[PDB]
Design a protein around this ligand. Sequence first.
Ligand SMILES: COc1cc(CS(C)(=O)=O)ccc1Nc1nc(Nc2cccc(F)c2C(N)=O)c2cc[nH]c2n1
Length: 347
Amino acid sequence: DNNFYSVEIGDSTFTVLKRYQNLKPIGSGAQGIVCAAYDAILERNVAIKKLSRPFQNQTHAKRAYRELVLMKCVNHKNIIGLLNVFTPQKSLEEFQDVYIVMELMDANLCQVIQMELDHERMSYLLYQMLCGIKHLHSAGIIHRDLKPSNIVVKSDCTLKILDFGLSFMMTPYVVTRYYRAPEVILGMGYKENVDLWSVGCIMGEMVCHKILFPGRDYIDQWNKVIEQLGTPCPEFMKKLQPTVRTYVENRPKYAGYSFEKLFPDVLFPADSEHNKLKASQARDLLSKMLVIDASKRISVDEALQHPYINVWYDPSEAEAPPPKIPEREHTIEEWKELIYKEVMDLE
Ligand SMILES: COc1cc(CS(C)(=O)=O)ccc1Nc1nc(Nc2cccc(F)c2C(N)=O)c2cc[nH]c2n1
């Protein structure tokens, strides 16, 4: 009660611990509004995300639960940490909302994408994304839904991934699918380098300042992919389920564009010999990530070692000890209790 106070943030009531002051909306996502606030105790700014009845359905519940668990057992500079978590409700019966408190970053990657970046900053951002992704992989977490809106940065070019990736809900909210790999689009099996496709899409967009494959649905998405990259080889076709294979084979054939035409020198710093070489290397990396057939696409480790990226390589960041994580299907009440226990640090 008196340890909390309430403020109206648009159509959301934020009921927060008194230590958190001067709340201001910084944006919204799949789980609602996120605010910046000042933590009067730590004497610094924080982000506060409100999860409103996260147990209301299985999609929300599994995400909230997985986020709480993973944020706690991961400690890596490129993965967002949990500073605090609380509920203003006093019991399991009364339990409604979860508030997740994290260190405040300066912007998301969507903002960075709207800016020209030199090779130093671009390569460093990419290196960090790759480090974060590899760390998740080392715990057996394959993201599958990496996107700019869930990646945040500081003015000093430091970067953190906010979510842990991969349905029906009764909401006007539309999930952005533009960064998802062909394996995901087409319902194939996948491995770790599924996430490299997403890095490729983000890198391409950082370079050309436009979404590479902005499809209204998976059918339109696939069209945009093959238009740009070309129809995949017969070898790839055999990897597909019969129903998917007939669909992919019956689409109009496209030649695709060379990576020189997709990403011309004009989109890169390319004045000096230094910059010309970097542009060539950047394009080479793009040509290895934006590869439809995952069996020919670069691995995370190969990307970390790539000449465009490896200038930043540090074993403490790229080869950190794997997180130790301590398939669930539950009802509303079951999820409610699981999430409450996790918030309250109960067994
Ligand atoms: C001033 O602070 C910002 C300002 C902006 C807007 S701009 C135009 O400057 O890029 C974007 C991000 C941030 N910073 C931020 N945004 C976050 N998270 C979010 C921020 C906005 C919306 C969201 F859905 C989230 C989320 N999913 O958690 C988080 C989560 C943990 N730390 C964060 N830091």
